[PDB]
JSON list of C-alpha atoms in Angstrom, two decimals:
[
{"chain": "A", "resi": 1, "resn": "UNK", "atom": "CA", "xyz": [93.62, 64.04, 111.77]},
{"chain": "A", "resi": 2, "resn": "UNK", "atom": "CA", "xyz": [96.67, 63.31, 109.80]},
{"chain": "A", "resi": 3, "resn": "UNK", "atom": "CA", "xyz": [97.41, 64.93, 107.13]},
{"chain": "A", "resi": 4, "resn": "UNK", "atom": "CA", "xyz": [98.97, 68.38, 106.99]},
{"chain": "A", "resi": 5, "resn": "UNK", "atom": "CA", "xyz": [98.97, 71.90, 104.54]},
{"chain": "A", "resi": 6, "resn": "UNK", "atom": "CA", "xyz": [109.49, 88.28, 99.04]},
{"chain": "A", "resi": 7, "resn": "UNK", "atom": "CA", "xyz": [110.40, 86.19, 96.12]},
{"chain": "A", "resi": 8, "resn": "UNK", "atom": "CA", "xyz": [112.24, 86.49, 92.69]},
{"chain": "A", "resi": 9, "resn": "UNK", "atom": "CA", "xyz": [109.91, 87.77, 90.96]},
{"chain": "A", "resi": 10, "resn": "UNK", "atom": "CA", "xyz": [111.28, 91.54, 92.12]},
{"chain": "A", "resi": 11, "resn": "UNK", "atom": "CA", "xyz": [114.52, 90.74, 90.84]},
{"chain": "A", "resi": 12, "resn": "UNK", "atom": "CA", "xyz": [113.76, 89.05, 87.27]},
{"chain": "A", "resi": 13, "resn": "UNK", "atom": "CA", "xyz": [111.17, 91.49, 86.04]},
{"chain": "A", "resi": 14, "resn": "UNK", "atom": "CA", "xyz": [113.75, 94.13, 86.45]},
{"chain": "A", "resi": 15, "resn": "UNK", "atom": "CA", "xyz": [116.74, 92.10, 85.08]},
{"chain": "A", "resi": 16, "resn": "UNK", "atom": "CA", "xyz": [115.17, 91.77, 81.90]},
{"chain": "A", "resi": 17, "resn": "UNK", "atom": "CA", "xyz": [114.42, 95.67, 82.29]},
{"chain": "A", "resi": 18, "resn": "UNK", "atom": "CA", "xyz": [118.35, 96.25, 82.92]},
{"chain": "A", "resi": 19, "resn": "UNK", "atom": "CA", "xyz": [119.00, 93.77, 80.17]},
{"chain": "A", "resi": 20, "resn": "UNK", "atom": "CA", "xyz": [116.90, 96.26, 77.99]},
{"chain": "A", "resi": 21, "resn": "UNK", "atom": "CA", "xyz": [118.83, 99.12, 78.34]},
{"chain": "A", "resi": 22, "resn": "UNK", "atom": "CA", "xyz": [121.88, 96.96, 77.01]},
{"chain": "A", "resi": 23, "resn": "UNK", "atom": "CA", "xyz": [119.86, 95.92, 74.15]},
{"chain": "A", "resi": 24, "resn": "UNK", "atom": "CA", "xyz": [119.54, 100.07, 73.57]},
{"chain": "A", "resi": 25, "resn": "UNK", "atom": "CA", "xyz": [122.32, 102.41, 74.74]},
{"chain": "A", "resi": 26, "resn": "UNK", "atom": "CA", "xyz": [124.84, 99.47, 72.09]},
{"chain": "A", "resi": 27, "resn": "UNK", "atom": "CA", "xyz": [123.76, 101.17, 69.57]},
{"chain": "A", "resi": 28, "resn": "UNK", "atom": "CA", "xyz": [122.77, 104.50, 70.82]},
{"chain": "A", "resi": 29, "resn": "UNK", "atom": "CA", "xyz": [127.00, 104.39, 71.31]},
{"chain": "A", "resi": 30, "resn": "UNK", "atom": "CA", "xyz": [126.96, 104.06, 67.53]},
{"chain": "A", "resi": 31, "resn": "UNK", "atom": "CA", "xyz": [125.17, 106.59, 66.85]},
{"chain": "A", "resi": 32, "resn": "UNK", "atom": "CA", "xyz": [127.45, 108.62, 69.55]},
{"chain": "A", "resi": 33, "resn": "UNK", "atom": "CA", "xyz": [130.46, 107.16, 67.52]},
{"chain": "A", "resi": 34, "resn": "UNK", "atom": "CA", "xyz": [128.70, 108.76, 64.59]},
{"chain": "A", "resi": 35, "resn": "UNK", "atom": "CA", "xyz": [127.66, 112.10, 66.74]},
{"chain": "A", "resi": 36, "resn": "UNK", "atom": "CA", "xyz": [131.32, 113.02, 67.28]},
{"chain": "A", "resi": 37, "resn": "UNK", "atom": "CA", "xyz": [131.91, 112.03, 64.01]},
{"chain": "A", "resi": 38, "resn": "UNK", "atom": "CA", "xyz": [129.41, 114.44, 62.97]},
{"chain": "A", "resi": 39, "resn": "UNK", "atom": "CA", "xyz": [131.30, 117.22, 63.92]},
{"chain": "B", "resi": 1, "resn": "UNK", "atom": "CA", "xyz": [105.13, 78.57, 131.49]},
{"chain": "B", "resi": 2, "resn": "UNK", "atom": "CA", "xyz": [106.99, 82.13, 133.09]},
{"chain": "B", "resi": 3, "resn": "UNK", "atom": "CA", "xyz": [110.52, 81.61, 132.82]},
{"chain": "B", "resi": 4, "resn": "UNK", "atom": "CA", "xyz": [110.69, 82.20, 128.95]},
{"chain": "B", "resi": 5, "resn": "UNK", "atom": "CA", "xyz": [108.32, 83.25, 126.08]},
{"chain": "B", "resi": 6, "resn": "UNK", "atom": "CA", "xyz": [111.02, 82.83, 124.13]},
{"chain": "B", "resi": 7, "resn": "UNK", "atom": "CA", "xyz": [109.13, 84.49, 120.78]},
{"chain": "B", "resi": 8, "resn": "UNK", "atom": "CA", "xyz": [110.50, 83.13, 117.93]},
{"chain": "B", "resi": 9, "resn": "UNK", "atom": "CA", "xyz": [112.61, 86.29, 115.60]},
{"chain": "B", "resi": 10, "resn": "UNK", "atom": "CA", "xyz": [113.46, 86.12, 112.19]},
{"chain": "B", "resi": 11, "resn": "UNK", "atom": "CA", "xyz": [116.79, 84.48, 112.37]},
{"chain": "B", "resi": 12, "resn": "UNK", "atom": "CA", "xyz": [114.38, 82.06, 114.12]},
{"chain": "B", "resi": 13, "resn": "UNK", "atom": "CA", "xyz": [112.59, 80.83, 110.92]},
{"chain": "B", "resi": 14, "resn": "UNK", "atom": "CA", "xyz": [115.27, 79.46, 107.94]},
{"chain": "B", "resi": 15, "resn": "UNK", "atom": "CA", "xyz": [116.73, 82.25, 106.38]},
{"chain": "B", "resi": 16, "resn": "UNK", "atom": "CA", "xyz": [118.17, 82.89, 102.58]},
{"chain": "B", "resi": 17, "resn": "UNK", "atom": "CA", "xyz": [117.06, 79.04, 102.10]},
{"chain": "B", "resi": 18, "resn": "UNK", "atom": "CA", "xyz": [116.42, 79.46, 98.14]},
{"chain": "B", "resi": 19, "resn": "UNK", "atom": "CA", "xyz": [115.94, 83.08, 97.27]},
{"chain": "B", "resi": 20, "resn": "UNK", "atom": "CA", "xyz": [118.96, 84.20, 98.10]},
{"chain": "B", "resi": 21, "resn": "UNK", "atom": "CA", "xyz": [120.71, 82.32, 95.97]},
{"chain": "B", "resi": 22, "resn": "UNK", "atom": "CA", "xyz": [118.67, 83.66, 93.24]},
{"chain": "B", "resi": 23, "resn": "UNK", "atom": "CA", "xyz": [119.24, 87.03, 93.62]},
{"chain": "B", "resi": 24, "resn": "UNK", "atom": "CA", "xyz": [123.22, 86.36, 93.86]},
{"chain": "B", "resi": 25, "resn": "UNK", "atom": "CA", "xyz": [122.70, 84.22, 90.70]},
{"chain": "B", "resi": 26, "resn": "UNK", "atom": "CA", "xyz": [121.06, 87.15, 89.34]},
{"chain": "B", "resi": 27, "resn": "UNK", "atom": "CA", "xyz": [123.62, 89.83, 90.31]},
{"chain": "B", "resi": 28, "resn": "UNK", "atom": "CA", "xyz": [126.07, 88.27, 88.99]},
{"chain": "B", "resi": 29, "resn": "UNK", "atom": "CA", "xyz": [124.55, 87.86, 85.60]},
{"chain": "B", "resi": 30, "resn": "UNK", "atom": "CA", "xyz": [124.22, 91.91, 85.80]},
{"chain": "B", "resi": 31, "resn": "UNK", "atom": "CA", "xyz": [127.36, 92.29, 86.65]},
{"chain": "B", "resi": 32, "resn": "UNK", "atom": "CA", "xyz": [128.84, 89.81, 83.92]},
{"chain": "B", "resi": 33, "resn": "UNK", "atom": "CA", "xyz": [126.25, 92.08, 81.22]},
{"chain": "B", "resi": 34, "resn": "UNK", "atom": "CA", "xyz": [127.64, 95.02, 82.74]},
{"chain": "B", "resi": 35, "resn": "UNK", "atom": "CA", "xyz": [131.31, 94.18, 82.03]},
{"chain": "B", "resi": 36, "resn": "UNK", "atom": "CA", "xyz": [130.38, 93.36, 78.45]},
{"chain": "B", "resi": 37, "resn": "UNK", "atom": "CA", "xyz": [128.97, 96.68, 78.16]},
{"chain": "B", "resi": 38, "resn": "UNK", "atom": "CA", "xyz": [131.94, 98.40, 79.57]},
{"chain": "B", "resi": 39, "resn": "UNK", "atom": "CA", "xyz": [134.36, 96.18, 77.58]},
{"chain": "B", "resi": 40, "resn": "UNK", "atom": "CA", "xyz": [132.56, 97.40, 74.17]}
]
């Protein structure tokens, strides 16, 4: 008798997804810049 | 053992040991990304 024996996975897994938005909207913004320039 | 049970509560256990730092830094990262996106 001598020995004895929430997390970040709920955030990072969404954080990259949020970063995914940052990797998707920006180009669409350029398309938006083209969209207002298309009419 | 009748004077007081003294049942442990949520605050009795350690709080904000290491997870809260991760949540805070991830919040700061998201805020910085949002500021950078709004800048453009």
